[PDB]
């Protein structure tokens with residue numbers, strides 16, 4: 001066994017001068033509740049190898065030590081931390097109740113060994129990965145909401161689409177904290193076609209698309225400048241906190257910063273992660289309230305309604321239900337649904353028709369209009 | 377898809393190798409020095425142990441994955457400034473992510489080698505699911521090496537290569553060396569690896585790079601050998617079919 005049998009003399013070097021947490025049993029052969037905890041105690045000795053050291057002191061053989069700590073009960077378990085009594089547990093306990101006590105006192109010790117594991121073991125190790133998932137979850141901007149203003153679906157249309165949405169934005173801004181992200185559109189489709197024509201990789205295409213999303217953010221942010229709403233970037237988003245606090249809204253470019261480090265698609269050079277993914281992950285990172293995609297259709301249909309005489313509208317669908325229906329062309333990029341399932345903060349998205357007045361304002365107030373795509 | 381810089385040799389130096397200090401770094405700097413008149417190198421550097429400390433503080437604060445990735449990436453950036461300083465007399469400098477992405481051809485026409493961070497600039501846009509950033513040093517090196525259509529990627533570790541179990545772990549006796557592997561085979565098997573699980577995922581979608589050799593930087597000559605296609609460590613097949 002790992003249990004140390006102590007003596008009145010041995011207590012100075014085995015308990016006081018010994019490093020690490022020690023649990024000492026003040027027991028006696030006559031004591032009934034001792035005879036009960038004794039098997040439970042040498043069992044936890046193995047179950048707590050290297051975490052805690054178990055010690056036993058029979059009072060009948062060693063009667064000096066007990067009155068020094070005011071032991072007026074049997075059994076009494078004392079948890080020693082660097083020659084000082086940290087916690088006491090008088091009486092008999094069940095198997096579970098003992099662990100419950102030990103753990104509630106050895107939390108700082110468990111934290112220190114978990115920290116040590118996060119610095120010695122590989123990041124690929126499953127035990128390290130599992131201990132990390134168990135950490136606290138902080139939402140940076142929880143009362144904030146992320147909105148995507150479609151490139152081809154709205155900004156490429158111009159005045160008729162944009163001007164009303166600006167009016168909805170400047171007003172909604174008074175009640176909700178908005179992070180307005182932009183799409184790219186046909187100028188990006190053209191670059192992609194030219195670049196693809198040359199056989200340039202997705203990393204290169206990703207940089208081209210990023211610029212169109214920057215132009216759209218600059219144009220959208222100009223109509224909002226009189227209202228104090230700014231355009232943000234710099235790959236650090238240093239200006240976002242002050243702007244959200246004071247003016248309640250920002251305009252950012254929906255493109256991910258991946259550039260040449262853009263993960264390619266299964267086949268083809270079109271970047272798989274465009275503005276739907278850039279906007280979603282920014283909502284996911286900050287821990288935002290909701291993620292709204294403002295497009296040119298009521299939401300998701302069975303097929304593309306621009307190329308379908310009659311398609312059935314889907315008001316509520318899950319990603320598994322979407323994948324199982326096998327969508328030929330989706331309202332959102334296929335990898336966004338794979339990111340939605342993996343998401344920690346944004347466990348559902350909403351698609352709305354920004355060409356219809358009030359749709360944004362109504363969706364913002366929480367009312368379900370259009371398609372809600374849920375993670376599970 | 378065209379190979380942008382087909383004459384490029386991408387070499388990733390492990391963060392834990394940097395962490396070893398002068399004992400590992402000084403010989404490696406001499407090996408690297410002697411390599412400059414042979415290859416046109418892009419030397420990308422990993423994060424190591426400091427990234428773990430930024431993770432232990434960051435997670436204790438409850439910070440998300442997208443907060444931790446820039447933080448981790450910063451550490452790789454610092455090992456890079458260290459390595460580049462040792463090679464400064466050879467006209468080598470650390471260059472930032474925007475310069476790697478856009479002006480690498482000029483910088484490599486100017487000098488024989490440049491140092492950069494291995495980690496990709498995913499910043500806030502890092503993928504969720506795990507509280508630990510998935511796209512790390514090995515992943516960032518490969519995405520960039522394959523993007524440029526380079527001649528190759530060589531991972532410089534503090535181990536001989538990939539093993540069946542951690543060779544510096546508790547079950548080190550039951551660990552055996554793997555001279556060759558597939559990205560698919562490693563992805564299927566679960567447990568620890570000297571490389572990111574994300575690297576194997578990105579290797580499935582690779583376009584040009586066929587093999588990635590994992591070599592021991594604590595053994596002088598290994599890196600020199602690997603760069604010449606000599607099998608001196610673990611070769612990882614990506615699943616990019618040749619002609």
Ligand SMILES: Nc1ncnc2c1ncn2[C@@H]1O[C@H](COP(=O)(O)OP(=O)(O)OP(=O)(O)O)[C@@H](O)[C@H]1O
Pocket residue numbers: 149150151152153154182183184185186188274275276295296297299300301302303304305306329330331332
């Ligand atoms: N099943 C479907 N239901 C609804 N719309 C669909 C469907 N299939 C295709 N679509 C179309 O998909 C498009 C998705 O939006 P769009 O192409 O405008 O992207 P965007 O937000 O402008 O992004 P980017 O920056 O990549 O250009 C819509 O124009 C919509 O008509």
Ligand SMILES: Nc1ncnc2c1ncn2[C@@H]1O[C@H](COP(=O)(O)OP(=O)(O)OP(=O)(O)O)[C@@H](O)[C@H]1O
Pocket residue numbers: 121122123389390391392393421422423424425512513514533534535537538539540541542543544545568569570571
């Ligand atoms: N299957 C395995 N084969 C080889 N080494 C392994 C394996 N599993 C775990 N390891 C461990 O991984 C270590 C390498 O550490 P790690 O990959 O974290 O460092 P690095 O590559 O230098 O870091 P960075 O990601 O910052 O560039 C080896 O020293 C070894 O102990």
Ligand SMILES: [Mg+2]
Pocket residue numbers: 390514533570571572
């Ligand atoms: Mg490694």
